[PDB]
Amino acid sequence: MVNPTVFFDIAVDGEPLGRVSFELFADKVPKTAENFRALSTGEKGFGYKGSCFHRIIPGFMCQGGDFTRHNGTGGKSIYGEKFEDENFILKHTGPGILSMANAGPNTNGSQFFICTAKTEWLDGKHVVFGKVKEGMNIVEAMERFGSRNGKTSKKITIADCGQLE
Ligand SMILES: O=C1NS(=O)(=O)c2ccccc21
Ligand SMILES: O=C1NS(=O)(=O)c2ccccc21
Ligand SMILES: O=C1NS(=O)(=O)c2ccccc21
Ligand SMILES: O=C1NS(=O)(=O)c2ccccc21
Ligand SMILES: O=C1NS(=O)(=O)c2ccccc21
């Protein structure tokens, strides 16, 4: 089947910035892709809409998905529990790679990061499950609001999100 595409409409201190869309590699990592797809549509009753990118490190990555504690300490999968690292088939090859944050082997929840460079040292530790398809320039615009320690200088939020045809 055809891989799902999801979009995030990003806002900066509540002003619209632009749209970033992702291919999710359901053909390689179906469980991981389905988690992110469902959280992006809100079909389980919760997920990414209204949440923020809480950690952004320019030249490295923009990190989000903590819709429970808003700071890197929370998140929730669609599965009732944190889930396995499905496989490490896909690697951190460059800008645009969408990968799972975690707290150790087999502890995937809802946090993820969009790489803005090649991050090969994360291979085998974080599960890659998608890639920016359109709006990488918007990820680049976002990255500028990050800082050395990851704290953001403006509030970067997913104003809306869902699945495209
Ligand atoms: O691809 C899948 N990985 S899974 O075990 O979570 C699962 C459950 C049900 C249907 C499909 C799939
Ligand atoms: O239908 C599904 N129920 S499930 O969420 O466990 C799942 C996981 C992956 C792909 C499809 C499906
Ligand atoms: O909407 C929700 N229903 S839920 O209690 O499972 C939940 C848990 C955490 C964040 C949001 C939500
Ligand atoms: O070491 C890490 N733990 S984490 O999942 O928050 C994370 C996200 C991005 C890059 C590195 C790391
Ligand atoms: O320049 C780009 N335009 S894009 O949105 O297709 C994209 C995706 C991934 C890496 C780079 C780029």
Side-chain angles (χ1 to χ4, degrees):
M1 335 206 81
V2 153
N3 279 335
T5 293
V6 296
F7 70 86
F8 288 177
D9 284 337
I10 305 290
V12 176
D13 284 337
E15 300 301 338
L17 178 69
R19 167 170 291 195
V20 180
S21 72
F22 312 96
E23 178 175 1
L24 301 177
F25 302 128
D27 67 341
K28 310 284 189 58
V29 275
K31 190 173 190 180
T32 306
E34 174 64 11
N35 182 66
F36 186 95
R37 187 204 58 81
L39 291 174
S40 298
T41 65
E43 63 197 65
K44 308 303 182 171
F46 57 87
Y48 297 141
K49 187 173 173 180
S51 69
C52 69
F53 284 79
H54 64 278
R55 185 157 204 263
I56 298 172
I57 298 182
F60 179 25
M61 61 85 214
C62 301
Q63 193 177 333
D66 183 357
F67 65 80
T68 71
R69 299 189 59 75
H70 330 297
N71 69 357
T73 66
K76 179 177 169 58
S77 86
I78 65 170
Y79 301 118
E81 58 182 339
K82 297 295 165 63
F83 68 97
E84 72 269 28
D85 298 312
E86 184 164 20
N87 61 64
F88 301 104
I89 296 162
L90 299 167
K91 306 314 171 179
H92 301 83
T93 51
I97 291 287
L98 184 63
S99 184
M100 288 305 288
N102 59 49
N106 306 309
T107 56
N108 294 291
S110 59
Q111 290 190 50
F112 61 88
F113 58 99
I114 304 170
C115 289
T116 54
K118 185 179 177 177
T119 62
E120 69 276 7
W121 64 85
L122 302 177
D123 296 345
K125 298 188 181 191
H126 295 278
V127 172
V128 170
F129 68 89
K131 196 186 192 352
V132 172
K133 153 196 275 278
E134 190 168 55
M136 188 71 201
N137 64 319
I138 304 299
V139 178
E140 300 166 350
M142 289 163 59
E143 183 176 26
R144 300 197 190 96
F145 297 111
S147 69
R148 258 195 92 152
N149 66 20
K151 281 174 40 56
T152 58
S153 56
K154 298 195 186 287
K155 177 71 134 194
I156 308 300
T157 55
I158 296 162
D160 194 8
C161 48
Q163 188 174 353
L164 297 166
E165 315 195 311

